[PDB]
C-alpha cells in the first residue's frame, strides 16, 4: 500500500514537481491539499493512501521529502503555487552546493545534513502500517546527487534492512554533455549504488529529446517536458498499487522477476503511446500495435540499441481497456519475431500486468488522450555498451590525473578511483559471462 518518495538535488526535485502535479490530478486533490466537495464517492475508498495521508481536518499531505544542498530550488517550491501542499519541515535545504564534487557531498557537506533526512524518513515510516518500498529520484552526473544519494541509501539500507528500494536514475548521455567531470562522478556513484539498490532504471536526456522531436512535433523541448514524461512512467508503474485490475503487481515481484544475479540489476524503460493529438485521431491503437511498438528502438527512453544484446527478462505493464487474451496473443507474436532474442537459459521470458485505469491527460501536456497504454521494464546485455564508453572517458582523463586535486583536497584517497574502475571492469566481465551460451552437454 504505502510508498515513500525521496527527491535529491536539482533533477530529482524538478522531476518531483511534475510527479506530484500528476498524482494530484489523478486522485483529484487540489494544490492546497483539500479535496473538493463535488468529488464524491458512492463507497469509501483508499487509493489516495499510497501517496497521501490525512491530518483529520481533511487536508491531504504527501509522503515525500525534498533534499537539496543549494536553497534555490527548494525556495522555489516554497514560494511557488504548491506552497501549502508540502509540510514545511519536509522541505530541507542547505547553504551551498556540492560543486560537482562527489567528495564534497559525501565527505564534507552531506555529513552535516544526513541526520535531518533520517529523522524525517523515520517520522514518515512511523505513520505507516504497510510500507512496501522506497522510490528514489536523482542524477549521478552531479556532485550532491551522487554523494548524498549514496550516503543516504547506505544509511537507509542499514536502518530499514530488507525493505525494497527502487531507484530512478538519470545517467550521462552518450554525446550530449553538460559538465567536464561527469565520468568521475558517475563511476564513483555507481560503485556505491551497485551494493545498495534492488533495481536501477536508466534514463538519458538525448533519448527523450529524440522522442519529443520524432513522435511529438516539438522543435525546442525543455526539462518540463522530460519531467512530465518521467512522471507518466512512474504513474504507470505505481498504478498497479492504486487501482483495480486483472493482474496486479507488487513492488517485490519486480525484484523477484527481473534480477537474475545480485549484481545484474540495471534495467531499460520504454513507453508506447507517446503521440501528439493530431496524429492520435488518424490511427487506431490496438494492443498488438503498441506491443510491437515497445520493442522498437524508436520507443525507448535510453540511448542503447537492444539488437546488440540478448534479453533476460521483460515486464510489461498494461493500463486501461485491455483484455488478457490480446496480451497473450501479442506476446506470442513477439516471441515469434527473429530480431528479438532471449538468452537460452531464460525460457519463460515475460511478466504481465493488467490494470483498468487508463492514463491521465494533463491540461498543459503535450501527449494526446488515449484509452490504453503499455509500459515496459526489461533486462538486457546491451547495457554493457553504455558502461564501456563511460569507462573509456574515465581512462582518458585519469591517465593524466586531469582533475584529481579537487577530489583529493575535499577528502578522498587516490586509491578510490582505481577501486571503482576495477569494480566497473568486473561488471563488464559479468555481462560478458552471463551472455555466453552453454553448449557443453558432453
Amino acid at each position: 500500500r504505502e510508498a515513500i518518495c525521496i527527491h535529491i538535488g536539482q533533477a530529482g526535485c524538478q522531476v518531483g514537481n511534475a510527479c506530484w502535479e500528476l498524482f494530484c490530478l489523478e486522485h483529484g486533490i487540489q494544490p492546497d491539499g483539500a479535496m473538493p466537495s463535488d468529488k464524491t464517492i458512492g463507497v469509501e475508498d483508499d487509493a489516495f493512501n499510497t501517496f497521501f495521508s490525512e491530518t483529520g481536518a481533511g487536508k491531504h499531505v504527501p509522503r515525500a521529502v525534498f533534499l537539496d544542498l543549494e536553497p534555490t530550488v527548494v525556495d522555489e517550491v516554497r514560494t511557488g503555487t504548491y506552497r501549502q501542499l508540502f509540510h514545511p519541515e519536509q522541505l530541507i535545504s542547505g547553504k551551498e552546493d556540492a560543486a560537482n564534487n562527489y567528495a564534497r557531498g559525501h565527505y564534507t557537506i552531506g555529513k552535516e545534513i544526513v541526520d535531518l533526512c533520517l529523522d524525517r524518513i523515520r517520522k514518515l515510516a512511523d505513520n505507516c502500517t504497510g510500507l512496501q518500498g522506497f522510490l528514489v529520484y536523482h542524477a549521478v552526473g552531479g556532485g550532491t546527487g551522487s554523494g548524498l544519494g549514496a550516503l543516504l541509501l547506505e544509511r537507509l539500507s542499514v536502518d530499514y534492512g530488507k525493505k525494497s528500494k527502487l531507484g530512478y536514475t538519470v545517467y550521462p548521455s552518450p554525446q550530449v554533455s553538460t559538465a567536464v567531470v561527469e565520468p568521475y562522478n558517475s563511476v564513483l556513484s555507481t560503485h556505491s549504488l551497485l551494493e545498495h539498490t534492488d533495481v536501477a532504471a536508466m534514463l538519458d536526456n538525448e533519448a527523450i529529446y529524440d522522442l519529443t522531436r520524432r513522435n511529438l512535433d516539438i522543435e525546442r523541448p525543455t526539462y518540463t517536458n522530460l519531467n512530465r514524461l518521467i512522471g507518466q512512467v512512474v504513474s504507470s508503474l505505481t498504478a498497479s498499487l492504486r487501482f483495480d485490475g486483472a493482474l496486479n503487481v507488487d513492488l517485490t515481484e519486480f525484484q523477484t522477476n527481473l534480477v537474475p544475479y545480485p549484481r545484474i540489476h540495471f534495467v531499460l524503460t520504454s513507453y508506447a503511446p507517446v503521440i501528439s493529438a493530431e496524429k492520435a485521431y488518424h490511427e487506431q491503437l490496438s494492443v498488438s500495435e503498441i506491443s510491437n511498438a515497445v520493442f522498437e528502438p524508436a520507443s525507448m527512453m535510453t540511448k542503447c540499441d537492444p539488437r546488440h544484446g540478448k534479453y533476460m527478462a521483460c515486464c510489461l505493464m498494461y493500463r486501461g481497456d485491455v483484455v488478457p487474451k490480446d496480451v497473450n496473443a501479442a506476446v506470442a507474436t513477439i516471441k515469434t519475431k527473429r530480431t528479438i532474442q532471449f538468452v537460452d537459459w531464460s525460457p519463460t521470458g515475460f511478466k504481465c500486468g493488467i490494470n483498468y485505469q487508463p492514463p491521465t491527460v494533463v491540461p498543459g501536456g503535450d501527449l494526446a488522450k488515449v484509452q490504453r497504454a503499455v509500459c515496459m521494464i526489461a533486462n538486457s546485455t546491451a547495457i554493457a555498451e553504455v558502461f564501456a564508453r563511460i569507462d573509456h572517458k574515465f581512462d582518458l582523463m585519469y591517465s593524466k590525473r586531469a582533475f584529481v586535486h579537487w577530489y583529493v583536497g575535499e577528502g578522498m584517497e587516490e586509491g578510490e578511483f582505481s577501486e571503482a574502475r576495477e569494480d566497473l571492469a568486473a561488471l563488464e566481465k559479468d555481462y560478458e559471462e552471463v551472455g555466453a551460451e552453454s553448449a557443453d552437454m558432453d
Binding site: 486522485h27 468529488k39 463507497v43 483495480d244 486483472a246 493529438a277 485505469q357 491527460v361 494526446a368 488522450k369
Partner: protein, 48 residues
C-alpha cells in the same frame, strides 16, 4: 469537471475520469452482452 468510469471488464471500486470534454483517441473495442452464464444457463432463450 470529473465523472465516474464504468466497469465493463470487471472491478468493483469506483474510478475517477478526468476531463470528459476531451474525447479519447484510438479505436474503441467491440463489445456485446454475450457472457458465459447466458450461454451455459439460458438454454430457454427460444420457446419453440
Amino acid at each position: 469537471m470529473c465523472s465516474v468510469h464504468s466497469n465493463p471488464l470487471g472491478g468493483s471500486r469506483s474510478r475517477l475520469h478526468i476531463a470528459p470534454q476531451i474525447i479519447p483517441a484510438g479505436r474503441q473495442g467491440s463489445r456485446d452482452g454475450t457472457t458465459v452464464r447466458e450461454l451455459t444457463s439460458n438454454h430457454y432463450s427460444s420457446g419453440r
